[PDB]
Structure formats: structure tokens, C-alpha cells
Amino acid sequence: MMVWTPVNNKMFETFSYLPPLTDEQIAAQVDYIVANGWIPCLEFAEADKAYVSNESAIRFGSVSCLYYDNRYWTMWKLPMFGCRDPMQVLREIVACTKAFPDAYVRLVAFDNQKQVQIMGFLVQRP
Amino acid sequence: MMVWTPVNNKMFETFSYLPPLTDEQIAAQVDYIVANGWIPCLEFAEADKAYVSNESAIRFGSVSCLYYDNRYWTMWKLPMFGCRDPMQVLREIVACTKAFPDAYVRLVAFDNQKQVQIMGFLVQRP
Amino acid sequence: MMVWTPVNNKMFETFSYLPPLTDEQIAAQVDYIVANGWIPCLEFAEADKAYVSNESAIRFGSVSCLYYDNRYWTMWKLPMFGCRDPMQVLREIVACTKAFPDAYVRLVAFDNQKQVQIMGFLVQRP
Amino acid sequence: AGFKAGVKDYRLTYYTPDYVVRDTDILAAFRMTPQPGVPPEECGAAVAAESSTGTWTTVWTDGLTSLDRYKGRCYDIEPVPGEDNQYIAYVAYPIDLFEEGSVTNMFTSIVGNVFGFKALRALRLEDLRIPPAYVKTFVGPPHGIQVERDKLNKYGRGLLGCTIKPKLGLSAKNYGRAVYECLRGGLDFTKDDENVNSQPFMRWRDRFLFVAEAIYKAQAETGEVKGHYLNATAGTCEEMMKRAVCAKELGVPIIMHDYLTGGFTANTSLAIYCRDNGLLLHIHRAMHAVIDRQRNHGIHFRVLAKALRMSGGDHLHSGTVVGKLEGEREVTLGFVDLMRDDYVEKDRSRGIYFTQDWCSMPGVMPVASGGIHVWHMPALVEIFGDDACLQFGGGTLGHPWGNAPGAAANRVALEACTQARNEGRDLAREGGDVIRSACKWSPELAAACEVWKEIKFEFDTIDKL
Ligand SMILES: O=C(O)[C@@](O)(COP(=O)(O)O)[C@H](O)[C@H](O)COP(=O)(O)O
Ligand SMILES: [Mg+2]
Asked: What does the record list as GO biological process (chain D)?
């Protein structure tokens, strides 16, 4: 029996339980975005704003249900509407992480027909 | 596209989005106070009391609407009732900032007919 | 006009606005306890438990009115029932402050007919 | 004084041109266009009669009461210069005719039936004199301009807002995303579009929660108080109140209501709720131009603005003058004073037919919104001064770099104009120079300046004095 550690073992949603994505594996995910016509977007957060938290509920009555702080991160530029070139997405990952080398950075993609984010994973951890 | 940084980018209301006010620009604002017959006043706060916060809402029921801590700062002396000399105002800015060199300091002015603060901007950052 | 500083200026109720009590002045207050037949007692608190705070109101509904944490401090031994000797009160002050040299320490006295604390002042600051 | 059955002219009872108006009378100025063959005196008298105590034939029950005490009175008629069949008819209404605190009741008398009379071709209510004794029966605005600035801790410049776009079709989470990005760049406020209520693409409570997250995120990031006007406009008063309650329980600062499409009865209730619970109330004037656009018929916006001040609102849209929706300068300056000030003297050059004494009822913040961008900033600051909210929806969400840069561009433009004005610069003459200078400095502003440099809205005005 191996014990799953509770210490320093925070996760970042999809693909957090796999080995860290290689550059090739990230590029394959970008290809999947482009193949399905989805809208790439980058988002980032400083460490203090990267993890779900509850501090704004101090201002509430009994209405905290499915309210959390830090679900929203900061948009890098705009969603890449009309982008069908995986190399452009990869270049923006480089630019975002260059500008914010200490930030958490995630690559997401939007579907405008379901009007929902349809993929996402972390591409940089401080 | 340039990205507006979310990191270490806190603001202090009027004139925070312009270049730092030189002394001449500050003096010009003082002249506008005097030209309009408004009442100059200085206010200051230590860094821990300078930024809007929510900690007193722990004591509340569902009445936090438009309640924030740290809107009030500390008054420097009294409002300069009857002051029509810009150099007196400028001297008080120097005196306040010398007494509290690590404080945030703002110059405000009051209109007693509207009974409201009618101008204000930061003159000192720690 | 002199400006009353808001920074690092916390007070401790009765006699905080006077010059620090001399040993003669403390002795005179102990005499007043004994002359009036009141019950001397010492109380102490570590720095984190010395000032009024509000943390327990997180567990409350709308019932925080006149509830504060840290009004109670820790009793030194027991109230000195039957003490009519100022030497004994001054001895315990020394004893309490030697045992807890990093603590805030206050001397209080109780009136059992009103059933209320009838005097009190800080005798030690960390 | 015997009862005599049958029809007689309205002017025998209701045209009293030597009447001295009382200081408690409500006065109305009607722009009246009679049918051919109907004398102006009779037309004015019919308007007075059928908005007060009279009907088309003599009734015996008049004799049980005192028609002298209660009747509306056409007390003056003046021909309109430039018009051969238009008149201004002035009618005085005893204060006893009106239900205390009810804009609904006041409108029901004054504009209830008279606009449909066959004997007139057109009728426009231009102004109302609301006497202090009637003003004092209203709760009025929840807070008003001074209190709003004090609650927000915001002084020394116009407030800045922004309607989220597309008007409809965004999800709740995308709404909050857009809001966060707008607020964090320097806007004080964002808002639901007037028609964003609760719909299949976005249900209201979902939006309220995600907007709350965005408000608090932008406030923590910037250190400035933020708000987003969450729309309480609803199909029923119960749904309106549920939405106001949710805003209260989220601790957020401001809601909005569409006072004309929701209606005065619901608006007044909501204003009272906002007073009792500390919420700012933004009022959107949706539908007003159905009523107020044409010079010959309807109700001038200045009357709709007085009515809102009475029913209650902390903000009210005032037009822009220079944007996509109509609002002539002098007309607009006049009703802005009527919205904000305590005492406004008669001034027909600004369309103010009556001296208006508000007897300390709080002033309403004018909101300039619709088709404005950074190059309009000097004109807006010049027209409105500091006590206004200037809103840039397309002018923020249409910035080429996104909402935060769009917000920053507007905030820089406003602050640069405000600083220039304070330094002695004439924004009417030097406004373009002020903006051009700030464009060169701020990259975010420069991008807005370039995209909207040639965009103006200059058309013939319909609502002319
Ligand atoms: O729906 C609109 O068009 C707006 O959201 C403005 O959008 P933009 O900022 O994108 O123009 C406002 O509601 C109008 O200003 C209302 O008109 P008014 O203020 O005249 O009542
Ligand atoms: Mg709108």
C-alpha cells in the first residue's frame, strides 16, 4: 500500500495527475484545439491569486453556494479568434511566460456554440 | 497588444492613471482649490490602513453593502478654513509628509455648499 | 496644532493617557485598594491575546453586539481575598511579571457588593 | 346654484386666466395643437378639465363638493413663435388632487386621458412645477450624488462606467469575465444592458454570482471601490425584489432598474428598498424616446427626469449630446440642472418653463452613455463637469487590445481632461490638444484614439426647443 500524500500536493485540474506535459504533448493539445476549430486563450495569475479561496464570503449572507474567489484568472491579450495556426499559439505561450515568469499560466480554449471553455491545462508553474 | 498587469498595480483614485504629479502640477491643483474657494485638507494613513478592506464585516449580518474599512484616513490638523494662500497649503503638505514620511498622504478639498469632498489626490507614497 | 498620531499608539484603558506610573504612584494605587477594602487580583496575557479582537464572530449569526475576544485575560493565582497588606499585592506583581516577562500584566480590584471590577491598570508591558 | 343637465363649454369652468397660482399648486406647461375650429381657450380648458375634475357633460354631483377648490385651471395661454396652431397652455392643479408620494398618480391625472382627445391634434407636456409641499411627500432618491460619492470614496472627477456587450447572448461566466477585465483597467462601474434581465442564455442569479466574483477581484487588484449595476428589472415586483435581495446578500454596491418599462409603482418600491438596505440604484430610461422624441407630441424628457427624481434613483441617464442618441446641448444642460440641483430658475433658453425648488431632495447623478469614445471626453467633461457618470460600452469592449486596456484608455482620457481643466485649460477650445497629448503618452489611449479618430455623430435634431 502506498499512501497518497496530503502535503504540498495541490492540483490544477485537467492533466494534473499525468506526468508533466512535454513540449511535444503541449503541441499535440494545441493541434487538437485547431483541428476542432476552438478558440485558444491564455490566462495567468500570480501565486496569491492562483488558488481557489473564500475571502469575499465575509461580505455575504447565506449565499456562498458555488461562489469561490480566484476561479477567474487574468486574460493574456484576447482570445485568439480566427487563429488556426498552432505555431501562433505556441508563440503566445512563450510571450506570456516571458512577461510573467513567476505566474501560473494556463492554456484554455473556448467553443462559441456551447459557449463554454472546452479544454484547459496548466502550461507554467512558478 | 499590450497586457495590463494585474500584479502590484494598485491605484489611489483621481489622477492615479497619469504620470506622477510634479511639484508644479501639484501647485496648480492647489491654485484650483483657492480659485474656487474650497477648503484644503490633508489626510494620511500608514500602509496597513491605506487600502480599502472588509475585515469589520465579520461582525455583521447581511448589511455589508457599501461598507468598507479604510475609506476614512487620519486628518492632518484641521481643514484649512479661510485659507486663500496656496503657499500655506504647500507648507502643510511638507509638514505632514515630514511628520509621517512612511505614510500615504492625500490632499483633498471640501465644498461646504454641496457638503462633499470636491477634489483629492495622493501627494505621498511610502 | 499638534497632531495625535494614529500609528503605534495603542492604549490600555485607565491611566494610559498619563505618564507611566512610577513605583510610588503604583504603590499609592495599591494603598487605595487596601483602604477601600477591595479584592486585589492580577491578570496577564501574551501579546496575541492582549488586545480586543473579533475572530470568534465567524461562528455567529447576527449576535456580535458587545461580544469581543480578548477581554478576558488569564488569572494570576486567585483574587487576594482577605488581603489588607500592600506588601502582598506588590509581591505578587513581581511574582507574576517574573514568571511571564513577555506578557502584558494588569492589576485589578474587585468590589463584592457591587460585584464588579472597581479599578484596574496595566503594570507590565512586554 | 342649480343643476342644469347638458353639455356646455369647458372654458366656462376651467379657463381662468386671472387665477393667481398658489405656491402649493402643481403647474403644467402643455404644448397644444387644437383641431381647426377649436379655440385655444376651449382646448386649454378641456385639457385642464379632463386632467382634474371634469367630463363632457354637466354632472349634478359637482354641487356636493366645491369645484372652486378642486378644479384644474388653465390660467394662461401663449402662442408659440414660429407656429400658427401651437400654443403653450399653463394649467394649475390643486395639491389636494394628488396622492402623496405617488408619481403614478400625478401622471395619471396630468397625462392620463387628455392626449387622446379628438378636439386636439397633438399635445406635449413640456414641464411641471413640482412645489416643495408635494416634493416633501416623496422618499425620493435612495442616496443622491453626495452620499454616493461618500459611499464609494470617489471624488474630483466624473465616474466611469461601461455596458457589457453583446447586449444579449453572453453566458453568466463570460459576463463576469468581461466585467473583471473592464473594472480592473480603471472603470469604476460596469453594467448589465437594460434588456439583460434573466434569459435562456444567462439566468440572473448565475450572472449576479459571477459578477460578484469579478467586482471583488477587480477591487482587490486595483484598490479602488468597484461596482456593476446588476439589473433588478423583472416581469413582476416579486422577481424584482428577489433580485435586489440577492444583491444585498452578496454585499455588492449597486443595482439598476428600467424605470419606464418596469414602471413607476415598481420603481418607487425598489427605491425604498434601496434606501432601507443601502444599495445604490442606477436608473435606465429605456422607452423614454417613445414618449419624448417629437416636439409636437408626448412628454419632454425633463418631465420624465423630474418624475424619476421623485420616484427615486441615484443615477439617471441624461444623454451625451455628442453620441449616438439625440440630446441637444441647451435642452440637456437645462434638465441636468433639474436633475442635480436644489433650485433651478425659469430659463426658456434651456427649456425650463418653471422655477423648480427641490427643497433639499437629493440630486440624481446624470449618466452620459451611448456611442461615446475617448475623443468625446473633453466635450463630456465640459458639458457635465465632475458630477456625472460617463459610460463607454462599445468604447471599452471595442478597444483593439481588450477590456482592461480599453478601460485604462478611458480612465487616462478622463483624468487628463480633468487635470487640464483644473490647470486652467479651456476644454471647449483645447480638448483635442489635451487628448492628442495623452494619446502620445499612453499606449492604451493611443490605440483607442487611432481606431475612433474619425467617428462622430452629427445629425439634424428632432427635439429642438
Ligand atoms: O444599450 C446601449 O446602447 C447602451 O448600453 C450604451 O452602449 P454603448 O456604450 O456601447 O453605446 C446604453 O444603454 C445607452 O446609452 C442608453 O441610451 P441613453 O443613455 O440615451 O438612455
Ligand atoms: Mg444598454
From this structure: photorespiration; reductive pentose-phosphate cycle
What are the residue boundaries of the structural domains of chain B, listed by start?
2-126
For residue D79, what are the CA distances in angstroms to A66, D12, D37, D41, D346? 65, 21, 16, 11, 18
DSSP secondary structure of B17-53 = TSSP--HHHHHHHHHHHHHTT-EEEEEEE-GGGSS-B
Q: Is residue D448 part of a domain?
A: yes
Instruction: Provide the CB-side half-sphere exposure for B78 (13 A, CA).
Output: 5
Take residue B34 and report the three cell numbers written for it.
483657492
Which fold would CATH assign to domain C2-126? Ribulose 1,5 Bisphosphate Carboxylase/Oxygenase (3.30.190)
| DSSP 8-state symbol, D350 | G
- For residue D100 the three cell numbers come to 402623496
Separation in Å, CA of B13 to nearest CA in chain A: 22
| C-alpha distance from residue D318 to each of A25, A107, D390 (Å) | 56, 43, 10
Q: For residue D244, what are the domain limits? A: 139-452
* Largest distance between two CA atoms of chain B: 50
Helices (H), D117-171: 132-135, 145-152
Asked if residues D231 and D208 have their Cβ atoms less than 8 Å apart, the reply is no
D417 close to D437: Cβ distance less than 8 angstroms: no
The letter for the amino acid at B124 is Q
Contacts with D, A 61-100, CB within 8 Å: 61-63, 66-72, 74-75, 77-78
Terminal-residue alpha carbon distance, chain B: 32
**Beta pairing, strands D315-317 & D365-369:** parallel
Q: How many CA atoms lie within 13 A of C92 on its CB side?
A: 21
D165 tagged catalytic: yes
Q: Structure resolution in Å?
A: 1.4
Gap between the terminal Cα atoms of chain C: 32
Q: How far is CA D124 from the centre of its chain?
A: 17
Looking at residue D228, which CATH number applies to its domain? 3.20.20.110
Judge whether D48 and D27 are in contact, CB under 8 Å.
no
In eight-state DSSP terms, residue C69 is: B
Does residue D193's CB lie within 6 angstroms of at least one atom of ligand 1?
yes
3-class secondary structure, D283: strand
Q: Are the C-beta atoms of B92 and B75 separated by less than 8 Å? A: no
